[PDB]
Ligand binder design. Sequence first.
Ligand SMILES: O=C(Nc1ccc(C(=O)NCc2c(C(=O)O)oc3ccccc23)cc1)NC1CC1
Length: 167
Amino acid sequence: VNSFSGYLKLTDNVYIKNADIVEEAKKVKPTVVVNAANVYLKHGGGVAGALNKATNNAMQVESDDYIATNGPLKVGGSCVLSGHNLAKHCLHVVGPNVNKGEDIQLLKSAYENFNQHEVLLAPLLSAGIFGADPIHSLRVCVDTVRTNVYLAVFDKNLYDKLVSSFL
Ligand SMILES: O=C(Nc1ccc(C(=O)NCc2c(C(=O)O)oc3ccccc23)cc1)NC1CC1
């Protein structure tokens, strides 16, 4: 028994709620919150900017030191850094960006990173396909992640189509 509340059971290990992950992070203080990062860990907008803003830019300061030491992540890769005031840990995961010509097939490799953590609060990845084929992103999560994932979905048009499609 964990502390996630109001999430709907989608599958054996996947749960889903209509909410802003940042606001959910401010609440539960989970062991792991997932960030939909870019390979430079430049947290300008979206989940990254919203998470980073909620940390008063401490996430960005830590991230810049990480990149200066290690260089950029791979698309489909991840790193574990501090969760700051939002979680014990933040798993920064890079999904492919179709807007930059990156290959959507890398989405499965991105979700595989979740399997290194028993329980995670996470968003859907590759938001660049959210108008073209939003269902594609959630199908991969369910078919790839075997650990317990609590998905916080921001868009209500989306959540309704998603839960409808998988029930
Ligand atoms: O900006 C924020 N939050 C914030 C910002 C951005 C997101 C986000 O990239 N989600 C991913 C997503 C969603 C959804 O979540 O609807 O659907 C999808 C379909 C396909 C692929 C991906 C997705 C999530 C949360 N907060 C600030 C104003 C206070």
